[PDB]
């Protein structure tokens, strides 16, 4: 029975290859060349924030583009004021191994994860004049790698046990579970229309997931090694991915293909975290050689390099107004560029 | 704007209040030593854990001669560990445990050691090695009916050590075997490595209690070597 299943799976693979081939019309490079060049967008540094001991693993800007939050490996969460370079809320952590953090879209909740296979949620607006842990969710069988809200009652969690899930704070259970990766999943980003999202995993493939129905909509290939960076275009009909093979790529959901690859020759260390921009013209990536890069989207050229970090870089994020970007590396510092 | 001015003053007060506690916590973070306790199923990790404890992630905290030690073991994870292994790059030294008797699953252990000793985020950490279950080793080798050359063909021509510290209640065969295994583990640690981290082996058995002083000596050697490389003094 297994031989017949493998044979029909190979037939389906051939059919899907034919369907992908038929949809191909022309390359993006030739048709994007007629555009005028973007030009040098070399940037500089601004206010630098200090006061962390060990390295950094996550950072999420916010909505009003004025606050931010960062997590470190001494079990320390800190909420920063970007404008006046201060501190407002510093919270300890129960488990000293934390991997991913996030800021709520409403500017009211802070989410933290880590290696304890449990997710903790902190309510900034308190009725007793102190940050206290209200809710924690459990049920996974492996390390967490992302926790990004939809609203004040929905969150999507991704675990190293090859599963993602959608939770509800009031009931604290799993409403729906997304399974079927056969590997480890690392990073997810939602969509501007708040209807679908994606999951990037070590299986060398990405997937598109929907919240209401639950079943996966489509799958994407192309990368060889582990995938460890993903984001979403402003329109919601594209997404760029970064993996360990030091190659970034772009996918369009409508065409269901891979459009452009941003490569080079003197790059041998892989990407770690990426983000997009406001107009859809700047695409930011962090690498391992202690330097970060800013590419252009429509064309295939790079004009602009960010430097100033000693150890490896981990977190990177653009604003909701395009005013600036934030970047954090494995040396307990956070640098803000404009 | 006077309300705004005093609000800004209060915010600066909040920043100062945060900074004070951060300094108080930094004073304590840097005076503790954290170690990993990697091992396998056939080996014995719980015995050592109890020995240094009678004095998803499970922790043992102990203290010798007014020096504090924190120790981590990871059992709640899945099989693969290529991703959560990088959370340990400021660890002072790893601990590795290998069963000296069960010869079928010996090679496997060796392979793991190589991956610890040759990496990017693990190439600046020292390793303390424990070959456990010595009594079973002696009994099994002395009783015969188990050729070492069956699994390691390069043992028959092995030469006994030029120097050693054999107890008076020992015979040439047990010393021969228990030194062949130790040099087998030691050969990997000297081929590569540009004088940044070392290996410190010991022999241990189930009935043992002085397995915490060895940790003190090893850690002191590690810290001294790391300090003398910054002040340019060989």
């Amino acid at each position, epitope marked *: 029975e297994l031989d017949q299943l493998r044979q029909e799976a190979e037939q389906l693979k051939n059919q899907i290859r034919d369907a992908r081939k038929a949809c191909a019309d022309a390359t993006l490079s030739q048709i994007t060349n007629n555009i005028d060049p973007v030009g040098r967008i070399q940037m500089r540094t601004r206010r630098t924030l200090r006061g962390h001991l060990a390295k950094i693993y996550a950072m999420h800007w916010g909505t009003d583009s004025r606050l931010l939050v960062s997590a470190s490996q001494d079990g320390k969460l800190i909420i920063w004021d970007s404008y006046t370079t201060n501190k407002v809320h510093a919270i300890p952590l129960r488990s000293s191994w934390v991997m991913t953090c996030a800021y709520a879209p409403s500017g009211n909740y802070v989410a933290c994860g880590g290696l304890d296979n449990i997710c903790s949620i902190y309510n900034l607006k308190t009725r007793e004049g102190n940050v206290r842990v209200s809710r924690e969710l459990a049920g996974h069988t492996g390390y967490l790698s992302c926790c990004r809200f939809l609203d004040d009652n929905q969150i999507v969690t991704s675990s190293g046990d090859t599963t993602c899930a959608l939770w509800d704070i009031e009931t604290g259970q799993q409403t729906t579970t997304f399974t079927g990766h056969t590997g480890d999943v690392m990073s997810l980003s939602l969509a501007p229309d708040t209807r679908l999202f994606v999951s990037g995993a070590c299986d060398a493939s990405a997937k598109l997931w929907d919240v209401r129905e639950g079943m996966c909509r489509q799958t994407f290939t192309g990368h*060889e*090694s582990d995938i460890n960076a993903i984001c979403f275009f402003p329109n919601g009909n594209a997404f760029a991915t970064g993996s360990d093979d030091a190659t970034c790529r772009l996918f369009d959901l409508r065409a269901d293909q891979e459009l452009m690859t941003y490569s080079h020759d003197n790059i041998i260390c892989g990407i770690t975290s990426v983000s997009f921009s406001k107009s859809g013209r700047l695409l930011l990536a962090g690498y391992d050689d202690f330097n970060c890069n800013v590419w252009d989207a429509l064309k295939a050229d790079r004009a602009g390099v960010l430097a100033g970090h000693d150890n490896r870089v981990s977190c990177l994020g653009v604003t909701d107004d395009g005013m600036a970007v934030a970047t954090g590396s494995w040396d307990s510092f956070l640098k803000i560029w404009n | 704007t006077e309300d705004q001015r005093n609000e800004e003053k209060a915010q600066r007060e909040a920043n100062k209040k945060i900074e004070k506690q951060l300094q108080k916590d930094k004073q304590v973070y840097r005076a503790t030593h954290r170690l990993l306790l990697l091992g396998a199923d056939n080996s014995g990790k719980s015995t050592i854990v109890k020995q240094m404890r009678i004095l998803g992630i499970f922790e043992t905290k102990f203290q010798v001669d007014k020096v504090n030690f924190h120790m981590f073991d990871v059992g709640g994870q899945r099989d693969e*560990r*290529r991703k959560w*292994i990088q959370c340990f790059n400021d660890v002072t030294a790893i601990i590795f445990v290998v069963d000296s008797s069960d010869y079928n699953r010996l*090679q*496997e252990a060796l392979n793991l050691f*190589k*991956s610890i000793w040759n990496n990017r985020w693990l190439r600046t950490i020292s390793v303390i090695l424990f070959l456990n279950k010595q009594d079973l080793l002696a009994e099994k080798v002395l009783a015969g009916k188990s050729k070492i050359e069956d699994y390691f063909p*390069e043992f028959a021509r092995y030469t006994t050590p030029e120097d050693a510290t054999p107890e008076p209640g020992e015979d040439p065969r047990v010393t021969r075997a228990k030194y062949f295994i130790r040099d087998e583990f030691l050969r990997i640690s000297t081929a590569s490595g540009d004088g940044r981290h070392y290996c410190y082996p010991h022999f241990t058995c189930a009935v043992d209690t002085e397995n915490a002083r060895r940790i003190f000596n090893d850690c002191k050697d590690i810290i001294l070597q790391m300090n003398l490389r910054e002040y340019n003094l060989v």
Partner: nanobody
Framework: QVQLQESGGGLVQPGGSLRLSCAAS????????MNWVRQAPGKGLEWVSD????????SYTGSVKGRFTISRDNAKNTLYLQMNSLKPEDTAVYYC?????????????????????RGQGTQVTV
């Protein structure tokens, strides 16, 4: 996508000789360290032999130290293991593994319950 398919396997008389070849497609073959994995009935997975990036460093296991010869082919993008003077104790399923990270000198989790870079494998009887 990434694909690795093995070729070989069958009934072997004692003291026989065979060659097992795994072909791969979907990546640059000259940047990856690869090896072999075995599974005999009633037991778990085990390691046998391995090659380095440029075909310079080779290593084996003690159980088979003078009977096996492994060799890569970067031009034809294949890996070969040659078996001579077999033994009745070997009758197993063979897998052509792959180490994850390019441009590196180590790899974890080559032997695992599920890895997702491992070929299907063949089965040999002696």
């Amino acid at each position: 996508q990434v694909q690795l398919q093995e070729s070989g396997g069958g009934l072997v008389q004692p003291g026989g000789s065979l060659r097992l070849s795994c072909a791969a497609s979907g990546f640059t073959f000259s940047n990856y360290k690869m090896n072999w994995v075995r599974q005999a009935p009633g037991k778990g997975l085990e390691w046998v032999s391995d090659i380095s990036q440029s075909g310079a460093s080779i290593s084996y296991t003690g159980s088979v130290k003078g009977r096996f010869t492994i060799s890569r082919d970067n031009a034809k993008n294949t890996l070969y293991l040659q078996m001579n003077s077999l033994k009745p104790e070997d009758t197993a399923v063979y897998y052509c593994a792959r180490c994850p990270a390019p441009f590196t000198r180590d790899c974890f989790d080559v032997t695992s319950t599920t890895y997702a870079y491992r070929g299907q494998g063949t089965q040999v009887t002696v």
